[PDB]
Design an enzyme around this catalytic site. Structure first.
Site, PDB file in Angstrom:
ATOM      1  N   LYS B  15      38.389  38.046  40.994  1.00 32.72           N
ATOM      2  CA  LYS B  15      37.304  37.362  41.822  1.00 32.72           C
ATOM      3  C   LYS B  15      36.709  35.731  41.663  1.00 32.72           C
ATOM      4  O   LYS B  15      36.497  34.857  42.540  1.00 32.72           O
ATOM      5  CB  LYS B  15      35.922  38.158  41.437  1.00 32.72           C
ATOM      6  N   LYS B  41      30.167  38.414  32.493  1.00 37.76           N
ATOM      7  CA  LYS B  41      31.258  37.626  31.691  1.00 37.76           C
ATOM      8  C   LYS B  41      30.656  36.102  31.886  1.00 37.76           C
ATOM      9  O   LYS B  41      31.065  35.302  30.987  1.00 37.76           O
ATOM     10  CB  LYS B  41      32.520  37.898  32.344  1.00 37.76           C
ATOM     11  N   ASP B 129      32.894  47.036  39.349  1.00 33.54           N
ATOM     12  CA  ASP B 129      33.493  48.377  38.652  1.00 33.54           C
ATOM     13  C   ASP B 129      32.335  49.453  38.937  1.00 33.54           C
ATOM     14  O   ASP B 129      32.907  50.631  38.684  1.00 33.54           O
ATOM     15  CB  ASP B 129      33.901  48.173  37.273  1.00 33.54           C
TER      16      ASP B 129
HETATM   17  N1  LIG Z   1      46.710  34.023  42.391  1.00 33.07           N
HETATM   18  C1  LIG Z   1      46.724  34.061  41.166  1.00 33.07           C
HETATM   19  N2  LIG Z   1      47.945  33.740  40.105  1.00 33.07           N
HETATM   20  C2  LIG Z   1      47.768  33.463  38.852  1.00 33.07           C
HETATM   21  N3  LIG Z   1      47.038  34.019  38.080  1.00 33.07           N
HETATM   22  C3  LIG Z   1      45.753  34.408  38.630  1.00 33.07           C
HETATM   23  C4  LIG Z   1      45.670  34.614  40.302  1.00 33.07           C
HETATM   24  N4  LIG Z   1      44.477  35.108  40.505  1.00 33.07           N
HETATM   25  C5  LIG Z   1      43.798  35.366  39.133  1.00 33.07           C
HETATM   26  N5  LIG Z   1      44.695  34.984  38.151  1.00 33.07           N
HETATM   27  C6  LIG Z   1      44.425  34.985  36.666  1.00 33.07           C
HETATM   28  O1  LIG Z   1      43.854  36.357  36.617  1.00 33.07           O
HETATM   29  C7  LIG Z   1      42.928  36.143  35.248  1.00 33.07           C
HETATM   30  C8  LIG Z   1      41.495  36.839  35.899  1.00 33.07           C
HETATM   31  O2  LIG Z   1      41.044  36.354  37.105  1.00 33.07           O
HETATM   32  P1  LIG Z   1      39.570  36.140  37.180  1.00 33.07           P
HETATM   33  O3  LIG Z   1      39.330  35.364  38.711  1.00 33.07           O
HETATM   34  O4  LIG Z   1      38.926  35.779  36.055  1.00 33.07           O
HETATM   35  O5  LIG Z   1      39.119  38.048  37.500  1.00 33.07           O
HETATM   36  P2  LIG Z   1      37.562  38.535  37.684  1.00 33.07           P
HETATM   37  O6  LIG Z   1      36.763  37.319  38.061  1.00 33.07           O
HETATM   38  O7  LIG Z   1      37.907  39.500  38.641  1.00 33.07           O
HETATM   39  O8  LIG Z   1      37.312  39.417  36.437  1.00 33.07           O
HETATM   40  C9  LIG Z   1      42.659  34.768  35.084  1.00 33.07           C
HETATM   41  O9  LIG Z   1      43.456  34.534  34.232  1.00 33.07           O
HETATM   42  C10 LIG Z   1      43.180  33.984  36.446  1.00 33.07           C
HETATM   43  O10 LIG Z   1      43.579  32.699  36.046  1.00 33.07           O
HETATM   44 MG   LIG Z   2      34.902  36.657  36.989  1.00 34.99          MG
END
Ligand SMILES: Nc1ncnc2c1ncn2[C@@H]1O[C@H](COP(=O)(O)OP(=O)(O)O)[C@@H](O)[C@H]1O
Ligand SMILES: [Mg+2]
Ligand SMILES: Nc1ncnc2c1ncn2[C@@H]1O[C@H](COP(=O)(O)OP(=O)(O)O)[C@@H](O)[C@H]1O
Ligand code: SF4
Ligand code: SF4
Ligand SMILES: [Mg+2]
EC number: 1.18.6.1
Lengths: 271, 271
Positions: B15, B41, B129
């Protein structure tokens, strides 16, 4: 005596697969076990029951009038190895606290005498993406004496482990809820075991077992079985047997020492 | 006019990476955007601000006495492309509702006049979630007019998409909150795009874009940047530009039709 364990971790990390396979190995060993599903997804018992899922206490209470109209023998269902299974349920999305069913379920089980002297273990399978409401109840109310956190080298999984550890600390002055260990459920990356060992060391616990990623899990679950039942000769069956043995023998239960975001990032950097 | 969009999805699905890169592409296009972090977070703005994270409204309100002692110009911070950023925060694990800070933050922003006519977009980055408490507030209280769900071929990610869709349905009689589309954030499995297209079709929406898995994301985020800023020539930068263009041009906003667990499993079986 009976040991009360809870499995926490972020969504999709492997809590229900790990719990049901661990518990099947305990039953194979001769232990009497009950699983209490505390995740609204309500599929925490399906591999023991060979089922689609299980009808929940909240659902059954509504069909019956009140929770008092339910009897324990009508709610608990036995599956593989005699393991007894129950699902809490929860309100539909957008209404009420997603954890409200956990409170109802655990109180129902306690009042109805489900905690009979002959049980050896109770395992709660608990959603861990937020630690609040009914999902915090096993910690706040002293139900989940030994917490095991399923995690992986994924940053979000490790953050969730730290968050759950903070919840354990916050209730350290009452009850006896403690962190028993981390379980690494592999993403098939190397040094991953060393990463989770390092995180456990920083928290003051241990990594109790490294569970490999193995396609036999999917082949078992398509057939609504644990690996223990589906293919007792599988290498992965032996992995779950090793995890179960180490839970049985574990004597380290600690108030964990949560880490900073800088420490967590440094860990990922290093490994 | 100003479009109010919310990005939902399971934890760790992408996200915050997707939102910040999409928003950087919008600013590169000339749009005025605000990001409101609605995940405890609290790292939803760090890639725009080049920062560790951002201090939260709950934290600042406590240091200042009350939320009324805060001014908007002291809370909103601008980063890449002039994008304005704010983090809600939330209570520590084990105390209070993990979503309580979202309610405080959104009400603060509304009262203090943050929704100025010159903003073109507001993006809320929302934990998905559980759909309850403050995390349901953008839907219940008509703040998140267009919802985009980040997901993947992972069963848990698709279940979360269905759960969020159920929350949208439950408030369909009030306000104008609608599902705008699914965003597939690839696990580098093939037919994965076809899987998420199929899920979107069953829900009645569309898959607005398929975001590839690309290591340039990690190299950018280690340096606290979006890919858009870190390497504007990267193929992945163009992927985020395409996603942003399609969000801008999107006209399909629906009350979704949630599916059964049997339909969800059949989808995975097939693909
Ligand atoms: N398209 C992508 N390619 C490579 N890594 C990704 C991609 N999308 C997300 N990530 C990695 O996945 C991990 C989680 O992403 P994040 O945006 O922080 O998730 P959320 O906000 O849904 O908890 C991060 O380390 C991010 O850099
Ligand atoms: Mg996040
Ligand atoms: N060690 C493993 N090897 C292969 N697949 C696994 C393993 N652990 C979990 N899975 C798969 O991961 C998915 C999510 O696991 P699950 O236990 O349902 O997560 P949770 O209960 O934490 O949401 C399931 O499809 C499961 O079969
Ligand atoms: S987070 Fe769910 S209701 Fe408080
Ligand atoms: S789930 Fe968090 S407080 Fe209700
Ligand atoms: Mg589960």
């Amino acid at each position: 005596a009976m040991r009360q364990c809870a499995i926490y971790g972020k969504g999709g990390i492997g809590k229900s697969t790990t719990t049901q396979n661990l518990v099947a190995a305990l039953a194979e060993m001769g232990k009497k076990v009950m699983i209490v599903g505390c995740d609204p997804k309500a599929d925490s018992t399906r591999l023991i029951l060979h089922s689609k899922a299980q009808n929940t206490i909240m659902e059954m209470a509504a069909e019956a009038g009140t929770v008092e109209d339910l009897e324990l023998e009508d709610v608990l269902k036995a599956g593989y190895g005699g393991v007894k299974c129950v699902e809490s349920g929860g309100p539909e999305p957008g209404v009420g606290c997603a954890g409200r069913g956990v409170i109802t379920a655990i109180n129902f089980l306690e009042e109805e005498g489900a905690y009979e002297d002959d049980l050896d273990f109770v395992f709660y399978d608990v959603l861990g993406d937020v630690v609040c409401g009914g999902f915090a109840m096993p910690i706040r109310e002293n139900k989940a004496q030994e917490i095991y956190i399923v995690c992986s080298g994924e940053m979000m999984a490790m953050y969730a482990a730290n968050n759950i550890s903070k919840g354990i600390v916050k209730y350290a002055n009452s009850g006896s809820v403690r962190l028993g260990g981390l379980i690494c459920n592999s993403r098939n990356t190397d040094r991953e075991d060393e990463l989770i060992i390092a995180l456990a060391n920083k928290l003051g616990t241990q990594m109790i077992h490294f569970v490999p990623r193995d396609n036999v899990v999917q082949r078992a679950e398509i057939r609504r079985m644990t690996v223990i039942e589906y293919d007792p000769k599988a290498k992965q069956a032996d992995e779950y047997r090793a995890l179960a043995r180490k839970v049985v023998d574990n004597k380290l239960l600690v108030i964990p020492n949560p880490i900073t975001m800088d420490e967590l990032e440094e860990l990922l950097m290093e490994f």
